[PDB]
Amino acid sequence: VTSVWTKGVTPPANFTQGEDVFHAPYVANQGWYDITKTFNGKDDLLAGAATAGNMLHWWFDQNKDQIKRYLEEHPEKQKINFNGEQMFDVKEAIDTKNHQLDSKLFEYFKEKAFPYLSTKHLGVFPDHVIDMFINGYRLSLTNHGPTPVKEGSKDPRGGIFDAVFTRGDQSKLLTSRHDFKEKNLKEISDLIKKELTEGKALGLSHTYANVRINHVINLWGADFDSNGNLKAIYVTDSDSNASIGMKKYFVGVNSAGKVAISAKEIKEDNIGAQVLGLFTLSTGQDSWN
Protein backbone atom coordinates (compact mmCIF):
# COMPACT_ATOMS: atom_id res chain seq x y z
CA VAL A 1 0.00 0.00 0.00
CA THR A 2 0.96 3.69 -0.10
CA SER A 3 0.62 6.41 2.52
CA VAL A 4 0.52 10.18 2.82
CA TRP A 5 1.44 12.21 5.92
CA THR A 6 0.69 15.79 6.89
CA LYS A 7 3.39 18.18 5.66
CA GLY A 8 6.19 18.37 8.21
CA VAL A 9 4.84 15.44 10.22
CA THR A 10 7.21 12.59 11.09
CA PRO A 11 5.54 9.15 11.20
CA PRO A 12 5.79 7.68 14.72
CA ALA A 13 8.00 4.61 15.13
CA ASN A 14 7.02 3.77 18.70
CA PHE A 15 3.75 2.10 17.71
CA THR A 16 2.74 -0.69 20.10
CA GLN A 17 -0.32 -2.94 20.26
CA GLY A 18 -2.44 -2.39 23.34
CA GLU A 19 -5.61 -3.95 24.74
CA ASP A 20 -7.92 -1.71 22.72
CA VAL A 21 -5.80 0.12 20.14
CA PHE A 22 -2.51 0.21 18.23
CA HIS A 23 -0.89 3.49 19.27
CA ALA A 24 2.29 5.55 19.48
CA PRO A 25 2.94 7.30 22.82
CA TYR A 26 3.32 11.06 22.34
CA VAL A 27 6.80 12.34 21.48
CA ALA A 28 7.40 16.09 21.35
CA ASN A 29 8.94 17.94 18.41
CA GLN A 30 7.87 15.24 15.96
CA GLY A 31 5.57 17.56 14.04
CA TRP A 32 2.24 16.46 15.49
CA TYR A 33 0.23 17.36 18.60
CA ASP A 34 -2.20 15.77 21.02
CA ILE A 35 -4.06 18.33 23.12
CA THR A 36 -5.80 16.40 25.92
CA LYS A 37 -9.08 17.10 27.73
CA THR A 38 -9.19 17.07 31.55
CA PHE A 39 -12.98 17.23 31.63
CA ASN A 40 -12.69 20.08 34.11
CA GLY A 41 -16.23 21.06 33.16
CA LYS A 42 -15.05 23.57 30.57
CA ASP A 43 -13.42 21.36 27.95
CA ASP A 44 -15.78 18.36 28.33
CA LEU A 45 -17.36 19.07 24.91
CA LEU A 46 -14.56 21.05 23.27
CA ALA A 47 -12.87 18.37 21.14
CA GLY A 48 -13.52 20.67 18.20
CA ALA A 49 -11.44 23.37 19.85
CA ALA A 50 -8.95 20.69 20.84
CA THR A 51 -8.70 19.66 17.19
CA ALA A 52 -8.38 23.26 16.03
CA GLY A 53 -5.77 23.66 18.74
CA ASN A 54 -3.64 20.78 17.43
CA MET A 55 -3.91 22.18 13.91
CA LEU A 56 -2.86 25.61 15.19
CA HIS A 57 0.25 24.24 16.89
CA TRP A 58 1.19 22.64 13.57
CA TRP A 59 0.50 26.00 11.97
CA PHE A 60 2.87 27.69 14.45
CA ASP A 61 5.71 25.33 13.48
CA GLN A 62 5.07 25.87 9.77
CA ASN A 63 5.08 29.66 10.09
CA LYS A 64 7.59 29.94 12.96
CA ASP A 65 9.47 32.81 11.31
CA GLN A 66 6.53 34.23 9.38
CA ILE A 67 4.98 34.75 12.83
CA LYS A 68 7.99 36.14 14.71
CA ARG A 69 8.26 38.68 11.87
CA TYR A 70 4.53 39.43 12.06
CA LEU A 71 4.63 40.16 15.78
CA GLU A 72 7.65 42.45 15.32
CA GLU A 73 5.64 44.50 12.82
CA HIS A 74 2.55 44.43 15.08
CA PRO A 75 3.71 43.96 18.73
CA GLU A 76 0.17 44.94 19.71
CA LYS A 77 -1.18 41.65 18.38
CA GLN A 78 0.93 39.44 20.63
CA LYS A 79 -1.49 39.77 23.53
CA ILE A 80 -5.22 39.81 24.16
CA ASN A 81 -6.21 42.02 27.07
CA PHE A 82 -9.60 42.44 28.67
CA ASN A 83 -10.13 45.57 30.76
CA GLY A 84 -6.80 45.19 32.52
CA GLU A 85 -6.59 41.39 32.63
CA GLN A 86 -4.32 39.53 30.21
CA MET A 87 -6.37 36.77 28.59
CA PHE A 88 -3.79 35.49 26.13
CA ASP A 89 -0.22 35.93 24.89
CA VAL A 90 0.63 34.14 21.64
CA LYS A 91 4.29 33.63 22.57
CA GLU A 92 3.24 31.89 25.78
CA ALA A 93 1.15 29.66 23.53
CA ILE A 94 4.06 28.89 21.23
CA ASP A 95 6.35 28.15 24.17
CA THR A 96 3.83 25.68 25.57
CA LYS A 97 2.60 24.24 22.26
CA ASN A 98 4.04 20.80 22.98
CA HIS A 99 2.18 20.32 26.26
CA GLN A 100 -0.66 17.81 26.11
CA LEU A 101 -2.61 18.71 29.26
CA ASP A 102 -1.69 22.34 29.83
CA SER A 103 -0.82 24.04 26.55
CA LYS A 104 -1.58 27.73 26.95
CA LEU A 105 -3.58 27.72 23.70
CA PHE A 106 -6.09 25.12 24.89
CA GLU A 107 -6.15 26.73 28.32
CA TYR A 108 -7.21 29.95 26.60
CA PHE A 109 -9.87 28.02 24.67
CA LYS A 110 -11.57 26.28 27.60
CA GLU A 111 -11.11 29.04 30.21
CA LYS A 112 -11.52 32.34 28.36
CA ALA A 113 -12.76 31.79 24.80
CA PHE A 114 -15.36 29.04 25.15
CA PRO A 115 -15.99 28.66 28.91
CA TYR A 116 -19.78 28.16 28.75
CA LEU A 117 -20.16 25.91 25.68
CA SER A 118 -19.78 22.64 27.59
CA THR A 119 -22.44 23.72 30.10
CA LYS A 120 -24.84 24.45 27.22
CA HIS A 121 -24.33 21.04 25.60
CA LEU A 122 -22.65 22.86 22.70
CA GLY A 123 -19.40 22.05 20.95
CA VAL A 124 -17.44 24.01 18.34
CA PHE A 125 -16.13 23.28 14.84
CA PRO A 126 -12.37 23.50 14.11
CA ASP A 127 -12.77 25.94 11.20
CA HIS A 128 -14.89 28.45 13.13
CA VAL A 129 -12.32 28.34 15.93
CA ILE A 130 -9.40 28.84 13.56
CA ASP A 131 -11.20 31.49 11.51
CA MET A 132 -11.77 33.37 14.79
CA PHE A 133 -8.27 33.01 16.20
CA ILE A 134 -6.50 33.99 12.97
CA ASN A 135 -8.78 36.21 10.88
CA GLY A 136 -10.89 37.32 13.82
CA TYR A 137 -14.15 36.18 12.27
CA ARG A 138 -16.73 36.61 15.00
CA LEU A 139 -17.60 33.09 16.04
CA SER A 140 -21.35 32.71 16.47
CA LEU A 141 -22.76 29.56 18.07
CA THR A 142 -25.80 29.53 15.78
CA ASN A 143 -23.72 29.36 12.59
CA HIS A 144 -24.35 25.74 11.55
CA GLY A 145 -22.54 26.40 8.29
CA PRO A 146 -19.14 27.69 7.06
CA THR A 147 -17.78 31.09 8.02
CA PRO A 148 -19.56 33.68 5.85
CA VAL A 149 -16.64 35.33 4.03
CA LYS A 150 -17.48 38.97 4.75
CA GLU A 151 -16.01 42.07 6.32
CA GLY A 152 -17.04 42.89 9.86
CA SER A 153 -15.80 43.74 13.32
CA LYS A 154 -13.07 41.50 14.73
CA ASP A 155 -13.89 38.98 17.46
CA PRO A 156 -12.25 40.26 20.70
CA ARG A 157 -11.20 36.68 21.40
CA GLY A 158 -9.09 36.43 18.26
CA GLY A 159 -7.96 38.12 15.05
CA ILE A 160 -4.33 37.93 16.12
CA PHE A 161 -3.11 37.70 12.51
CA ASP A 162 -5.89 39.72 10.87
CA ALA A 163 -3.44 42.43 9.77
CA VAL A 164 -2.41 39.81 7.17
CA PHE A 165 -5.40 37.45 7.08
CA THR A 166 -8.39 39.77 6.68
CA ARG A 167 -12.12 39.13 6.89
CA GLY A 168 -14.18 39.19 3.71
CA ASP A 169 -11.30 38.14 1.45
CA GLN A 170 -11.45 34.53 0.24
CA SER A 171 -7.71 34.35 -0.46
CA LYS A 172 -7.14 34.78 3.28
CA LEU A 173 -9.50 32.03 4.44
CA LEU A 174 -7.13 29.25 5.47
CA THR A 175 -9.75 26.66 6.43
CA SER A 176 -12.43 24.57 4.72
CA ARG A 177 -15.17 22.11 5.69
CA HIS A 178 -16.46 19.11 3.72
CA ASP A 179 -19.53 16.93 4.24
CA PHE A 180 -19.02 13.12 4.24
CA LYS A 181 -22.46 11.92 5.35
CA GLU A 182 -23.56 10.39 2.03
CA LYS A 183 -20.14 9.97 0.42
CA ASN A 184 -18.68 6.61 -0.60
CA LEU A 185 -15.16 5.31 0.09
CA LYS A 186 -13.69 6.56 -3.20
CA GLU A 187 -15.02 10.09 -2.70
CA ILE A 188 -13.85 10.33 0.90
CA SER A 189 -10.47 8.80 -0.01
CA ASP A 190 -9.81 11.16 -2.90
CA LEU A 191 -10.68 14.31 -0.96
CA ILE A 192 -8.51 13.25 1.97
CA LYS A 193 -5.52 12.34 -0.19
CA LYS A 194 -5.79 15.61 -2.11
CA GLU A 195 -5.90 17.74 1.06
CA LEU A 196 -3.01 15.84 2.66
CA THR A 197 -0.82 16.37 -0.39
CA GLU A 198 -1.68 20.05 -0.76
CA GLY A 199 0.17 20.37 2.55
CA LYS A 200 -2.92 21.00 4.70
CA ALA A 201 -3.61 19.84 8.27
CA LEU A 202 -6.78 17.78 8.60
CA GLY A 203 -9.63 17.41 11.07
CA LEU A 204 -12.11 14.53 10.88
CA SER A 205 -15.57 14.30 12.45
CA HIS A 206 -17.40 11.01 13.10
CA THR A 207 -20.43 9.64 14.99
CA TYR A 208 -19.99 9.30 18.74
CA ALA A 209 -21.72 8.45 22.01
CA ASN A 210 -22.24 12.10 22.96
CA VAL A 211 -25.32 14.34 22.93
CA ARG A 212 -24.42 15.75 19.51
CA ILE A 213 -23.56 12.33 18.09
CA ASN A 214 -20.48 14.01 16.58
CA HIS A 215 -16.83 13.93 17.72
CA VAL A 216 -13.88 15.49 15.89
CA ILE A 217 -10.22 14.42 15.84
CA ASN A 218 -6.99 15.24 14.01
CA LEU A 219 -6.08 13.09 11.01
CA TRP A 220 -2.30 13.20 10.61
CA GLY A 221 -1.67 10.41 8.13
CA ALA A 222 -3.39 7.80 5.96
CA ASP A 223 -2.65 4.48 4.15
CA PHE A 224 -4.17 3.82 0.69
CA ASP A 225 -4.50 0.51 -1.20
CA SER A 226 -3.32 -0.28 -4.75
CA ASN A 227 -6.41 1.48 -6.11
CA GLY A 228 -6.05 4.55 -3.90
CA ASN A 229 -8.80 3.77 -1.39
CA LEU A 230 -8.27 4.30 2.34
CA LYS A 231 -7.26 1.37 4.53
CA ALA A 232 -6.23 3.21 7.68
CA ILE A 233 -5.66 6.63 9.20
CA TYR A 234 -3.50 7.96 12.04
CA VAL A 235 -5.21 10.26 14.48
CA THR A 236 -4.91 12.17 17.71
CA ASP A 237 -8.03 12.29 19.90
CA SER A 238 -8.52 14.83 22.70
CA ASP A 239 -10.81 12.37 24.51
CA SER A 240 -8.06 9.80 24.97
CA ASN A 241 -5.93 9.41 28.08
CA ALA A 242 -2.76 11.48 27.59
CA SER A 243 -0.69 8.28 27.70
CA ILE A 244 -2.12 6.95 24.41
CA GLY A 245 -0.94 9.45 21.80
CA MET A 246 -1.16 8.74 18.06
CA LYS A 247 -3.88 6.19 17.23
CA LYS A 248 -4.13 3.85 14.26
CA TYR A 249 -7.68 3.42 12.95
CA PHE A 250 -8.82 0.88 10.38
CA VAL A 251 -11.04 2.26 7.61
CA GLY A 252 -13.78 0.08 6.21
CA VAL A 253 -17.24 -0.06 4.72
CA ASN A 254 -20.42 -1.96 5.57
CA SER A 255 -22.90 -3.64 3.18
CA ALA A 256 -24.51 -0.22 2.59
CA GLY A 257 -21.24 1.34 1.50
CA LYS A 258 -21.07 3.65 4.53
CA VAL A 259 -17.49 4.46 5.56
CA ALA A 260 -16.50 3.88 9.19
CA ILE A 261 -13.33 3.93 11.29
CA SER A 262 -12.19 1.97 14.33
CA ALA A 263 -9.31 1.03 16.63
CA LYS A 264 -10.07 -2.54 15.54
CA GLU A 265 -10.89 -4.22 12.24
CA ILE A 266 -14.29 -3.24 10.88
CA LYS A 267 -15.26 -6.87 11.57
CA GLU A 268 -19.06 -7.34 11.53
CA ASP A 269 -19.69 -7.26 15.31
CA ASN A 270 -17.65 -4.07 15.71
CA ILE A 271 -19.12 -1.49 13.32
CA GLY A 272 -16.88 1.43 14.25
CA ALA A 273 -17.81 5.10 13.95
CA GLN A 274 -19.27 6.44 10.69
CA VAL A 275 -17.25 9.31 9.22
CA LEU A 276 -19.22 12.58 8.94
CA GLY A 277 -16.97 15.41 7.80
CA LEU A 278 -13.60 16.98 7.13
CA PHE A 279 -12.00 20.30 8.07
CA THR A 280 -8.72 21.73 6.82
CA LEU A 281 -6.11 24.35 7.62
CA SER A 282 -3.53 25.54 5.06
CA THR A 283 -0.37 27.34 6.21
CA GLY A 284 -0.99 30.29 3.92
CA GLN A 285 2.81 30.55 4.20
CA ASP A 286 3.04 32.65 1.06
CA SER A 287 0.56 35.38 1.92
CA TRP A 288 2.49 37.06 4.73
CA ASN A 289 3.65 39.61 2.15
Add this chain to the structure above:
Amino acid sequence: VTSVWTKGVTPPANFTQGEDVFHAPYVANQGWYDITKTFNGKDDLLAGAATAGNMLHWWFDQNKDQIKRYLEEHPEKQKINFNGEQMFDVKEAIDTKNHQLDSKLFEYFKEKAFPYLSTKHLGVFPDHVIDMFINGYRLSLTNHGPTPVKEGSKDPRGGIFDAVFTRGDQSKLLTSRHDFKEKNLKEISDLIKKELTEGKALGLSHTYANVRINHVINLWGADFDSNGNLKAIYVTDSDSNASIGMKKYFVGVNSAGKVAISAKEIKEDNIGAQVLGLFTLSTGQDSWNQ
Protein backbone atom coordinates in the same frame (compact mmCIF):
# COMPACT_ATOMS: atom_id res chain seq x y z
CA VAL B 1 -51.73 54.72 56.40
CA THR B 2 -48.00 55.48 56.58
CA SER B 3 -45.77 54.77 53.60
CA VAL B 4 -41.99 54.49 53.33
CA TRP B 5 -40.12 55.30 50.12
CA THR B 6 -36.60 54.63 48.92
CA LYS B 7 -34.13 57.40 49.67
CA GLY B 8 -34.15 59.92 46.83
CA VAL B 9 -37.34 58.56 45.30
CA THR B 10 -40.38 60.77 44.75
CA PRO B 11 -43.74 58.92 44.95
CA PRO B 12 -45.55 58.73 41.58
CA ALA B 13 -48.70 60.84 41.30
CA ASN B 14 -50.11 59.42 38.06
CA PHE B 15 -51.47 56.08 39.23
CA THR B 16 -54.40 54.79 37.18
CA GLN B 17 -56.43 51.64 37.80
CA GLY B 18 -55.69 49.64 34.72
CA GLU B 19 -57.09 46.49 33.21
CA ASP B 20 -55.02 44.17 35.42
CA VAL B 21 -53.02 46.44 37.71
CA PHE B 22 -52.94 49.77 39.53
CA HIS B 23 -49.83 51.45 38.11
CA ALA B 24 -48.08 54.75 37.39
CA PRO B 25 -46.55 55.34 33.93
CA TYR B 26 -42.81 56.01 34.10
CA VAL B 27 -41.58 59.59 34.48
CA ALA B 28 -37.84 60.30 34.54
CA ASN B 29 -35.84 62.08 37.20
CA GLN B 30 -38.14 60.96 39.99
CA GLY B 31 -35.46 58.81 41.58
CA TRP B 32 -36.77 55.42 40.45
CA TYR B 33 -36.00 53.31 37.38
CA ASP B 34 -37.70 50.74 35.20
CA ILE B 35 -35.26 49.02 32.86
CA THR B 36 -37.49 47.01 30.54
CA LYS B 37 -36.71 43.78 28.71
CA THR B 38 -37.16 43.83 24.93
CA PHE B 39 -37.04 40.01 24.78
CA ASN B 40 -34.58 40.13 21.92
CA GLY B 41 -33.27 36.70 22.87
CA LYS B 42 -30.46 38.09 25.01
CA ASP B 43 -32.31 39.77 27.90
CA ASP B 44 -35.15 37.23 28.07
CA LEU B 45 -33.94 35.76 31.37
CA LEU B 46 -32.01 38.71 32.83
CA ALA B 47 -34.53 40.13 35.32
CA GLY B 48 -31.74 39.79 37.88
CA ALA B 49 -29.39 42.00 35.87
CA ALA B 50 -32.15 44.52 35.13
CA THR B 51 -33.01 44.76 38.84
CA ALA B 52 -29.31 45.24 39.60
CA GLY B 53 -29.27 47.80 36.81
CA ASN B 54 -32.17 49.79 38.28
CA MET B 55 -30.42 49.67 41.66
CA LEU B 56 -27.16 50.84 40.08
CA HIS B 57 -28.98 53.73 38.34
CA TRP B 58 -30.30 54.77 41.77
CA TRP B 59 -26.73 54.40 43.04
CA PHE B 60 -25.56 56.73 40.24
CA ASP B 61 -27.93 59.39 41.54
CA GLN B 62 -26.95 59.02 45.22
CA ASN B 63 -23.22 59.12 44.47
CA LYS B 64 -23.26 61.52 41.51
CA ASP B 65 -20.64 63.96 42.86
CA GLN B 66 -18.46 61.21 44.31
CA ILE B 67 -18.49 59.28 41.02
CA LYS B 68 -17.61 62.45 39.10
CA ARG B 69 -14.54 62.98 41.30
CA TYR B 70 -13.67 59.28 41.23
CA LEU B 71 -13.64 59.16 37.42
CA GLU B 72 -11.54 62.33 37.40
CA GLU B 73 -8.95 60.67 39.66
CA HIS B 74 -9.09 57.27 37.94
CA PRO B 75 -9.50 58.08 34.20
CA GLU B 76 -8.80 54.48 33.16
CA LYS B 77 -11.86 53.16 35.01
CA GLN B 78 -14.40 54.95 32.83
CA LYS B 79 -14.18 52.49 29.95
CA ILE B 80 -14.05 48.71 29.66
CA ASN B 81 -11.99 47.62 26.64
CA PHE B 82 -11.60 44.10 25.28
CA ASN B 83 -8.67 43.57 22.93
CA GLY B 84 -9.32 46.79 21.04
CA GLU B 85 -13.10 46.90 21.33
CA GLN B 86 -15.01 49.15 23.73
CA MET B 87 -17.47 47.05 25.72
CA PHE B 88 -18.72 49.76 28.08
CA ASP B 89 -18.45 53.44 29.06
CA VAL B 90 -19.79 54.29 32.51
CA LYS B 91 -20.45 57.89 31.41
CA GLU B 92 -22.71 56.65 28.56
CA ALA B 93 -24.41 54.55 31.21
CA ILE B 94 -24.88 57.60 33.41
CA ASP B 95 -26.06 59.73 30.47
CA THR B 96 -28.65 57.14 29.44
CA LYS B 97 -29.70 55.89 32.88
CA ASN B 98 -33.20 57.37 32.50
CA HIS B 99 -34.07 55.20 29.48
CA GLN B 100 -36.33 52.21 30.09
CA LEU B 101 -35.60 50.29 26.88
CA ASP B 102 -32.11 51.23 25.76
CA SER B 103 -30.20 52.34 28.85
CA LYS B 104 -26.52 51.72 28.17
CA LEU B 105 -26.01 49.85 31.44
CA PHE B 106 -28.58 47.20 30.57
CA GLU B 107 -27.38 47.07 26.97
CA TYR B 108 -23.95 46.20 28.35
CA PHE B 109 -25.40 43.48 30.58
CA LYS B 110 -27.51 41.78 27.88
CA GLU B 111 -25.07 42.19 24.98
CA LYS B 112 -21.60 41.80 26.50
CA ALA B 113 -21.62 40.77 30.17
CA PHE B 114 -24.29 38.05 30.34
CA PRO B 115 -25.37 37.21 26.76
CA TYR B 116 -25.09 33.41 27.09
CA LEU B 117 -27.29 33.18 30.21
CA SER B 118 -30.61 33.50 28.35
CA THR B 119 -29.59 30.49 26.24
CA LYS B 120 -28.66 28.43 29.32
CA HIS B 121 -31.96 28.93 31.15
CA LEU B 122 -29.75 30.57 33.75
CA GLY B 123 -30.36 33.79 35.64
CA VAL B 124 -28.22 36.12 37.69
CA PHE B 125 -28.74 37.44 41.19
CA PRO B 126 -28.78 41.24 41.68
CA ASP B 127 -26.17 41.24 44.44
CA HIS B 128 -23.61 39.26 42.40
CA VAL B 129 -24.17 41.61 39.46
CA ILE B 130 -23.64 44.66 41.69
CA ASP B 131 -20.61 43.14 43.47
CA MET B 132 -19.00 42.52 40.07
CA PHE B 133 -19.83 45.95 38.64
CA ILE B 134 -18.69 48.00 41.67
CA ASN B 135 -16.04 45.94 43.53
CA GLY B 136 -14.99 43.69 40.67
CA TYR B 137 -15.90 40.47 42.48
CA ARG B 138 -15.87 37.57 40.04
CA LEU B 139 -19.42 36.52 39.31
CA SER B 140 -19.83 32.76 39.51
CA LEU B 141 -22.90 31.27 37.82
CA THR B 142 -22.69 28.22 40.11
CA ASN B 143 -22.48 30.14 43.40
CA HIS B 144 -25.96 29.85 44.93
CA GLY B 145 -24.82 31.73 48.01
CA PRO B 146 -23.73 35.33 48.78
CA THR B 147 -20.59 36.91 47.37
CA PRO B 148 -17.59 35.60 49.35
CA VAL B 149 -15.94 38.58 51.04
CA LYS B 150 -12.49 37.32 50.10
CA GLU B 151 -9.68 38.87 48.09
CA GLY B 152 -9.01 37.91 44.50
CA SER B 153 -8.53 39.20 40.98
CA LYS B 154 -11.00 41.62 39.46
CA ASP B 155 -13.67 40.44 37.02
CA PRO B 156 -12.78 41.97 33.62
CA ARG B 157 -16.48 42.81 33.25
CA GLY B 158 -16.57 45.22 36.18
CA GLY B 159 -14.55 46.51 39.11
CA ILE B 160 -15.27 50.03 37.88
CA PHE B 161 -15.09 51.53 41.38
CA ASP B 162 -12.69 49.05 42.98
CA ALA B 163 -10.10 51.73 43.84
CA VAL B 164 -12.55 52.59 46.61
CA PHE B 165 -14.75 49.52 47.05
CA THR B 166 -12.19 46.75 47.23
CA ARG B 167 -12.59 42.99 47.30
CA GLY B 168 -11.92 41.05 50.49
CA ASP B 169 -12.97 43.95 52.74
CA GLN B 170 -16.29 43.47 54.51
CA SER B 171 -16.70 47.22 55.03
CA LYS B 172 -16.70 47.60 51.23
CA LEU B 173 -19.45 45.08 50.43
CA LEU B 174 -22.49 47.23 49.70
CA THR B 175 -24.99 44.46 49.04
CA SER B 176 -26.90 42.07 51.29
CA ARG B 177 -29.14 39.07 50.73
CA HIS B 178 -32.05 38.00 52.96
CA ASP B 179 -34.17 34.85 52.88
CA PHE B 180 -37.89 34.96 53.69
CA LYS B 181 -37.89 31.26 54.59
CA GLU B 182 -39.75 30.37 57.79
CA LYS B 183 -40.60 34.09 58.14
CA ASN B 184 -44.00 35.66 58.88
CA LEU B 185 -45.85 38.78 57.70
CA LYS B 186 -44.43 40.86 60.54
CA GLU B 187 -40.79 39.79 60.24
CA ILE B 188 -41.01 40.58 56.52
CA SER B 189 -42.64 43.99 57.00
CA ASP B 190 -40.04 44.97 59.56
CA LEU B 191 -37.11 43.93 57.36
CA ILE B 192 -38.45 45.82 54.34
CA LYS B 193 -39.55 48.84 56.38
CA LYS B 194 -36.13 48.80 58.05
CA GLU B 195 -34.05 48.42 54.90
CA LEU B 196 -35.98 51.29 53.30
CA THR B 197 -35.41 53.46 56.38
CA GLU B 198 -31.69 52.77 56.44
CA GLY B 199 -31.49 54.42 53.00
CA LYS B 200 -30.94 51.33 50.82
CA ALA B 201 -32.31 50.29 47.45
CA LEU B 202 -34.18 46.99 47.56
CA GLY B 203 -34.68 43.96 45.34
CA LEU B 204 -37.55 41.53 46.02
CA SER B 205 -37.63 37.91 44.81
CA HIS B 206 -40.85 35.86 44.42
CA THR B 207 -42.30 32.67 42.91
CA TYR B 208 -42.85 32.87 39.18
CA ALA B 209 -43.42 30.90 35.98
CA ASN B 210 -39.78 30.26 35.08
CA VAL B 211 -37.19 27.51 35.42
CA ARG B 212 -36.10 28.51 38.93
CA ILE B 213 -39.59 29.59 40.06
CA ASN B 214 -37.84 32.77 41.16
CA HIS B 215 -38.21 36.23 39.59
CA VAL B 216 -36.72 39.44 40.98
CA ILE B 217 -38.11 42.99 40.83
CA ASN B 218 -37.33 46.42 42.35
CA LEU B 219 -39.13 47.49 45.54
CA TRP B 220 -39.24 51.28 45.65
CA GLY B 221 -42.02 52.02 48.14
CA ALA B 222 -44.20 50.33 50.74
CA ASP B 223 -47.49 51.17 52.46
CA PHE B 224 -48.11 50.05 56.04
CA ASP B 225 -51.38 49.83 57.96
CA SER B 226 -52.00 51.57 61.30
CA ASN B 227 -50.36 48.61 63.06
CA GLY B 228 -47.14 48.79 61.06
CA ASN B 229 -47.99 45.77 58.93
CA LEU B 230 -47.02 45.73 55.27
CA LYS B 231 -50.16 46.30 53.23
CA ALA B 232 -48.71 47.06 49.81
CA ILE B 233 -45.53 47.74 47.85
CA TYR B 234 -44.60 49.77 44.79
CA VAL B 235 -42.28 48.05 42.35
CA THR B 236 -40.95 48.12 38.81
CA ASP B 237 -40.71 44.81 36.94
CA SER B 238 -38.53 44.26 33.88
CA ASP B 239 -41.07 41.73 32.52
CA SER B 240 -43.82 44.38 32.30
CA ASN B 241 -43.99 46.42 29.08
CA ALA B 242 -42.66 50.00 29.10
CA SER B 243 -46.10 51.59 29.42
CA ILE B 244 -46.79 50.08 32.85
CA GLY B 245 -44.10 51.61 35.05
CA MET B 246 -44.53 51.57 38.82
CA LYS B 247 -46.89 48.77 39.87
CA LYS B 248 -48.76 48.58 43.14
CA TYR B 249 -48.85 45.15 44.80
CA PHE B 250 -51.08 44.09 47.66
CA VAL B 251 -49.39 42.04 50.37
CA GLY B 252 -51.02 39.39 52.53
CA VAL B 253 -50.95 35.85 53.88
CA ASN B 254 -52.83 33.55 51.49
CA SER B 255 -54.86 30.49 52.48
CA ALA B 256 -51.68 28.40 52.74
CA GLY B 257 -50.30 30.63 55.48
CA LYS B 258 -47.67 32.10 53.16
CA VAL B 259 -46.93 35.81 52.71
CA ALA B 260 -47.65 36.79 49.12
CA ILE B 261 -47.95 39.71 46.73
CA SER B 262 -50.38 40.35 43.89
CA ALA B 263 -51.77 43.02 41.57
CA LYS B 264 -55.06 42.36 43.37
CA GLU B 265 -56.05 41.71 46.99
CA ILE B 266 -55.05 38.37 48.43
CA LYS B 267 -58.29 36.38 48.73
CA GLU B 268 -59.45 32.77 48.84
CA ASP B 269 -59.54 32.95 45.03
CA ASN B 270 -56.23 34.83 44.72
CA ILE B 271 -53.16 33.56 46.57
CA GLY B 272 -50.68 35.68 44.65
CA ALA B 273 -46.98 35.03 44.30
CA GLN B 274 -45.05 33.87 47.35
CA VAL B 275 -42.17 36.17 48.37
CA LEU B 276 -38.77 34.45 48.52
CA GLY B 277 -36.13 37.00 49.45
CA LEU B 278 -34.70 40.50 49.46
CA PHE B 279 -31.52 42.07 48.12
CA THR B 280 -30.10 45.43 49.09
CA LEU B 281 -27.61 48.03 47.99
CA SER B 282 -26.30 50.77 50.25
CA THR B 283 -24.84 54.01 48.83
CA GLY B 284 -21.56 53.43 50.61
CA GLN B 285 -21.00 57.19 50.67
CA ASP B 286 -19.25 56.65 53.99
CA SER B 287 -16.40 54.90 52.17
CA TRP B 288 -16.31 57.70 49.60
CA ASN B 289 -15.56 60.05 52.52
CA GLN B 290 -12.21 58.27 53.03
